[PDB]
Design a protein around this ligand. Structure first.
Ligand SMILES: [Mg+2]
Ligand SMILES: [Mg+2]
Ligand SMILES: [Mg+2]
Ligand SMILES: [Mg+2]
Ligand SMILES: [Mg+2]
Ligand SMILES: [Mg+2]
Ligand SMILES: [Mg+2]
Ligand SMILES: [Mg+2]
Ligand SMILES: [Mg+2]
Ligand SMILES: [Mg+2]
Ligand SMILES: [Mg+2]
Ligand SMILES: [Mg+2]
Ligand SMILES: [Mg+2]
Ligand SMILES: [Mg+2]
Ligand SMILES: [Mg+2]
Ligand SMILES: [Mg+2]
Ligand SMILES: [Mg+2]
Ligand SMILES: [Mg+2]
Ligand SMILES: [Mg+2]
Ligand SMILES: [Mg+2]
Ligand SMILES: [Mg+2]
Ligand SMILES: [Mg+2]
Ligand SMILES: [Mg+2]
Ligand SMILES: [Mg+2]
Ligand SMILES: [Mg+2]
Ligand SMILES: [Mg+2]
Ligand SMILES: [Mg+2]
Ligand SMILES: [Mg+2]
Ligand SMILES: [Mg+2]
Ligand SMILES: [Mg+2]
Ligand SMILES: [Mg+2]
Ligand SMILES: [Mg+2]
Ligand SMILES: [Mg+2]
Ligand SMILES: [Mg+2]
Ligand SMILES: [Mg+2]
Ligand SMILES: [Mg+2]
Ligand SMILES: [Mg+2]
Ligand SMILES: [Mg+2]
Ligand SMILES: [Mg+2]
Ligand SMILES: [Mg+2]
Ligand SMILES: [Mg+2]
Ligand SMILES: [Mg+2]
Ligand SMILES: [Mg+2]
Ligand SMILES: [Mg+2]
Ligand SMILES: [Mg+2]
Ligand SMILES: [Mg+2]
Lengths: 158, 59, 263, 206
RNA sequence: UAGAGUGUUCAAAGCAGGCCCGAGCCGCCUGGAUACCGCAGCUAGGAAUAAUGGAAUAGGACCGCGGUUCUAUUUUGUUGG
RNA sequence: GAAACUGCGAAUGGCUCAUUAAAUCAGUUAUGGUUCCUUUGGUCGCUACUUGGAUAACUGUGGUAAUUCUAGAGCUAAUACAUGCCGACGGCGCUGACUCCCUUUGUGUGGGAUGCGUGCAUUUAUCAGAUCAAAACCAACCCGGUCGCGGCUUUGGUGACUCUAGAUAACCUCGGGCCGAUCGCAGCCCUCCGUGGCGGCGACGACCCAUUCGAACGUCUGCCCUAUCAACUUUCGAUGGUAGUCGCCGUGCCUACCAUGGUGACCACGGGUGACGGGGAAUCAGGGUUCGAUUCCGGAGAGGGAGCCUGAGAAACGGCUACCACAUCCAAGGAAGGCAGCAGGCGCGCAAAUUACCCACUC
């Protein structure tokens, strides 16, 4: 938490400064670091974890530098092995019109999951939005996790 | 060679700058008057608001 | 290849509301770059020989325009493919007549002569608002004009009545529920009615309703509404039949009763 | 030439794609600048739409700033010490963004002295006597506490910083791409970045 | 493409054309519709049929209360304790 | 008014369908992640009555078999090329010798000469970007007025900005940003006799902002046949993270370190296509089957591959350079070339028109 710099370069939030004035607090005090966060719009409440937390991710939509714009989609999680990003699945039904019948199809998508959400499990539903291309194959950031369908995360005393 | 023509041209070329300064001063002054006037209605609305707060705070 | 901008326009691909024929020849005038979009404009060449019949071939238009007779918003335009458009006020001094480009209710421009004490002001629709250097507020209208120092209550989607010798906006109508409006896009093109509603879907194409003088209602997109009146009282003059868009079962009856087969 | 096209490289599934066209001009590459240290040598290139673009080779001076004191002064650049991406740029002294450099730190001393009327990292009291003390103590009586007490309770230059001036070389970080703006600007290390990079330099090299 | 109007001399076509004074009208009327445009995306009503979910070692609502904790910046005119 | 320098255009148009199967293309959306000749509207004030040297056409002498080959000498222009003023600064901030009253001082006063910076734009760093629900004691204190009480506060915009505007400290591209050493019609006042002065209308150029015509990259869904193609992908970047290089901007686009990932029976990956995609065409009770090189829209290519100059725009071939394959001229030293534009010819084949006329119509 206080140790977050592991790479070969210092990690800090830009648009944030460390003043060096008024040294008298007494036996402890402020961590000496405020936090930068912003709102997303469209009705999405920023997670309190993003505010109170202490982490660095230039791509996290709630603190870092990305804008959400265009399509909004949702899908169920299917893999999280790459770091800070996950793999989700979307199932739909194509329509063959010779016959009058549907046929099942799916498509996998890589999205980027900030460390704000921490308790995601394979099977969770997640609502994601559209960003600028953040990597070769990543165009979508996670906006809101949920386990609201059956076989839920925790047992029925919530 | 400096004929009367080229002197006329320079005279006009600076005359235009003079006119532009004239226009800037006039426009700035007028808009400032109007904007300040708008501020008055703004504050009068604000004061009729805090005057109305003295009513619905009742009973 | 395409490696740069194109400069010809094929006759079939041209806009439909120009009402061009099919068998003259392969090209169409291709309006030159201007203040009005390429699909929404009406070049000056198409207004003088396909509508007013003043000229007959392209060269006659070129030698009508060269003599400095035609005025588009006071100024004297010499380019025959100049893109005139909605709210522009052509003036032909040598004859003493004036016109206003407004959509007729079938969704196309039509000739609309106006009184010369009216062709001194035109309406514009506000598109942008920004604060320039040193703190000066600006304005951008639908025909690219830039007004410096506008009143601090005029906002987007509003309408402003300017003068053609000064700019310097005079009046302004504010977009809200109850004012008149003319519609300038899509299916409902050239209809008039009170705005009566506006829904707002954040981030995508807010929708607007309208209501004619005969109960007929018809939604549209907000970026296609153009306020032309404070309420029930259009400021600028209107074409005959006033945007009422009668159905074909009515258009037939009027055609039959008037028996407009001659004069 | 060299190019930055997407289409030359394979897709998610691991399958190749066959070439779709000849290399366009808007996919253009051009070679690295590799700014060294020395007397100025700035070239220019013409980029898409006129728009001169100044490539920099062999720079020497930088407009570095001191965030706490709001000072900023054109300063000589002495050396490069640590590079956070590849290490063989410090062995060849190439000067790119987010490098770490030693600068001369003299104009900051001059500003601090003349503003706070106090001495920074000094060695003795012999050299300060023949000159420059005529600036530290003055004619003034009115002014000399009317303002210089406003400059007291504030001259508390950090220990990590104060220990640097005694050699006259300051750690700084570049914040500008020299190869695209021709300039090599940045800021001077404060606070916790200082401890970070002190640890890193002492750790890797030597 | 389907479809409306219009004697190209009829038709295929085309988007035209129609009226009266001999010229002395220095003209007038009117058209250049409409329907279709699968899927996918957008928008608001309906809730039959088909998926899907809520509390079983519980937790729903009434300002019901005690313990404990972080913290917001207003007023007491402002500024600071 | 020939020629010639200068500017602009030559990147549109025309032709063909070899390539190419999530590619191209269609509908749908996004640039808050970029560039934009031109047009339209804004913007244009921190030797000067006018500077410099040097070229073409033209005169004259030439070389080679040969080319839209060019050398030497003698002249001379600019909106080419290259320098560089005048006006009108009376600006304010920081500096502070001083001096002026009450408190010596400190702290409460007001001026203040002397000095540095003081237009827009570029690059880095910082600051602020307000109002929220009320009370009680301490110090200085505005105001209603006096020797301890009631009463007050400040651009614009978005669904959303590390937006727009503002302040501070600096920085500056020179030979490598801007603020007119240019041109044509029509006139006037003179403490007055052609100078000092000032009044109109345009052409041109130009910084940045917007607008226009675009262009570029990106999101969702959509494809013919094949299992006698079942596993593919990776330090020769394959999926991701951190920092940079580069680029018009987003991005393994590329480099360094790190992790071991990504795709597949919902057909991945490989192979074939007499496959350029679509608007559409033929037949058609209802459902369908087959076709789409071909006049509209999108893409791609000028014998095959590759590299680049100039420009706002080209990886351009009616542009240049080199290799491969062809082919022409020769005095054997050298030079020159690209009809899948319009006609025309050979070849190929079952298979396809004249080496005509004209800018009058559309542009
Ligand atoms: Mg072309
Ligand atoms: Mg090409
Ligand atoms: Mg044109
Ligand atoms: Mg440019
Ligand atoms: Mg038909
Ligand atoms: Mg017919
Ligand atoms: Mg179709
Ligand atoms: Mg649909
Ligand atoms: Mg519904
Ligand atoms: Mg409980
Ligand atoms: Mg020439
Ligand atoms: Mg050109
Ligand atoms: Mg190809
Ligand atoms: Mg294939
Ligand atoms: Mg293949
Ligand atoms: Mg696709
Ligand atoms: Mg499209
Ligand atoms: Mg697309
Ligand atoms: Mg031009
Ligand atoms: Mg202009
Ligand atoms: Mg000579
Ligand atoms: Mg990375
Ligand atoms: Mg990067
Ligand atoms: Mg594997
Ligand atoms: Mg696997
Ligand atoms: Mg394949
Ligand atoms: Mg086909
Ligand atoms: Mg083929
Ligand atoms: Mg059928
Ligand atoms: Mg085709
Ligand atoms: Mg073929
Ligand atoms: Mg053909
Ligand atoms: Mg084509
Ligand atoms: Mg397109
Ligand atoms: Mg050939
Ligand atoms: Mg050019
Ligand atoms: Mg080429
Ligand atoms: Mg060509
Ligand atoms: Mg050539
Ligand atoms: Mg050659
Ligand atoms: Mg050719
Ligand atoms: Mg031929
Ligand atoms: Mg034969
Ligand atoms: Mg035949
Ligand atoms: Mg034959
Ligand atoms: Mg012609």
């Amino acid at each position: 938490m206080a140790d977050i710099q592991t790479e070969r370069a210092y990690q800090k939030q830009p648009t944030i400064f460390q003043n060096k004035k008024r040294v008298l607090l007494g036996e402890t005090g402020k961590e000496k670091l405020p936090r930068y966060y912003k709102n997303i719009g469209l009705g999405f409440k920023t997670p309190k974890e993003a505010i109170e937390g202490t982490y660095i991710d230039k791509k996290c939509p709630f603190t870092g530098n990305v804008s959400i714009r265009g399509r909004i989609l949702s899908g169920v999680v299917t893999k999280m092995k790459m770091q800070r990003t996950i793999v989700i699945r979307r199932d739909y039904l194509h329509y063959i019109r010779k016959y009058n019948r549907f046929e099942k199809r799916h498509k996998n998508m890589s999205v980027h999951l900030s460390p704000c959400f921490r308790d995601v499990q394979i099977g969770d539903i997640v609502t994601v939005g559209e960003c600028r291309p953040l990597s070769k194959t990543v165009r979508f950031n996670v906006l809101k996790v949920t386990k609201a369908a059956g076989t839920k995360k925790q047992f029925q005393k919530f | 060679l400096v004929t009367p023509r080229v002197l006329q041209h320079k005279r006009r070329r600076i005359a235009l700058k003079k006119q532009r300064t004239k226009k800037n001063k006039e426009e700035a002054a007028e808009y400032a008057k109007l904007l300040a006037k708008r501020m008055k209605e703004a504050k009068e609305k604000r004061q009729e608001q805090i005057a109305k707060r003295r009513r619905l705070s009742s009973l | 290849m395409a490696r740069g901008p194109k400069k010809h326009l094929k006759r079939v691909a041209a806009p439909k509301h120009w009402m061009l024929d099919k068998l003259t020849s392969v090209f169409a005038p291709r309006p030159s770059t201007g203040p009005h979009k390429l699909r929404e404009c009406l070049p000056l060449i198409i207004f003088l020989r396909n509508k007013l019949k003043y000229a007959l071939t392209g060269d006659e238009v070129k030698k009508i325009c060269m003599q400095r007779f035609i005025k588009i918003d006071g100024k004297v335009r010499a380019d025959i493919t100049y893109p005139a458009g909605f709210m522009d006020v052509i003036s032909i001094d040598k004859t003493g007549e004036n016109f206003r480009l407004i959509y007729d209710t079938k969704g196309r421009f039509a000739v609309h002569r106006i009184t010369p004490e009216e062709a001194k002001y035109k309406l514009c629709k506000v598109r942008k608002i920004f604060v320039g250097t040193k703190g000066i507020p600006h304005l951008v209208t639908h025909d690219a004009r830039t007004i410096r120092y506008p009143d601090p209550l005029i906002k987007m989607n509003d309408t402003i009545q300017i003068d053609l010798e000064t700019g310097k906006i005079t009046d302004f109508i504010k977009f809200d529920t109850g004012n008149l409006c003319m519609v300038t896009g899509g299916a409902n093109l050239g209809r008039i009615g009170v705005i009566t509603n506006r829904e707002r879907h954040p981030g995508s194409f807010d929708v607007v309703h309208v209501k004619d003088a005969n109960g007929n209602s018809f939604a549209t997109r907000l970026s296609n509404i153009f306020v032309i009146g404070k309420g029930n009282k259009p400021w600028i003059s209107l074409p005959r039949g006033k945007g009422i868009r009668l159905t074909i079962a009515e258009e037939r009856d009027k055609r039959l009763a008037a028996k407009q087969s001659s004069g | 030439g060299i190019s930055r096209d997407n289409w030359h490289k394979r897709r998610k599934t691991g399958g190749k794609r066959k070439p779709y066209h000849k290399k366009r001009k808007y996919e253009l590459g051009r070679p690295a600048a590799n700014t060294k240290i020395g007397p100025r040598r700035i070239h220019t290139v013409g980029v898409r739409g006129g728009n001169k673009k100044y490539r920099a080779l062999r720079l020497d001076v930088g407009n570095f700033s001191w965030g706490s004191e709001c000072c900023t002064r054109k300063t000589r650049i002495i050396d490069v010490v640590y590079n956070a991406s590849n290490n063989e740029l410090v062995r060849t002294k190439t000067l790119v963004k987010n490098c770490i450099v030693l600068i001369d730190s003299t104009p900051y001393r001059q500003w601090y002295e003349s503003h706070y009327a106090l001495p920074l990292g000094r060695k003795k009291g012999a050299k300060l006597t023949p000159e420059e003390e005529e600036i530290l103590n003055k004619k003034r009586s009115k002014k000399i506490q009317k303002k210089y007490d406003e400059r007291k309770k504030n001259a508390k230059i950090s220990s990590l910083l104060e220990e640097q001036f005694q050699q006259g070389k300051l750690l700084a970080c570049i914040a500008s791409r020299p190869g695209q703006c021709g300039r090599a600007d940045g800021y001077v290390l404060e606070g916790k970045e200082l401890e970070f990079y002190l640890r890193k330099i002492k750790a890797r090299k030597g």
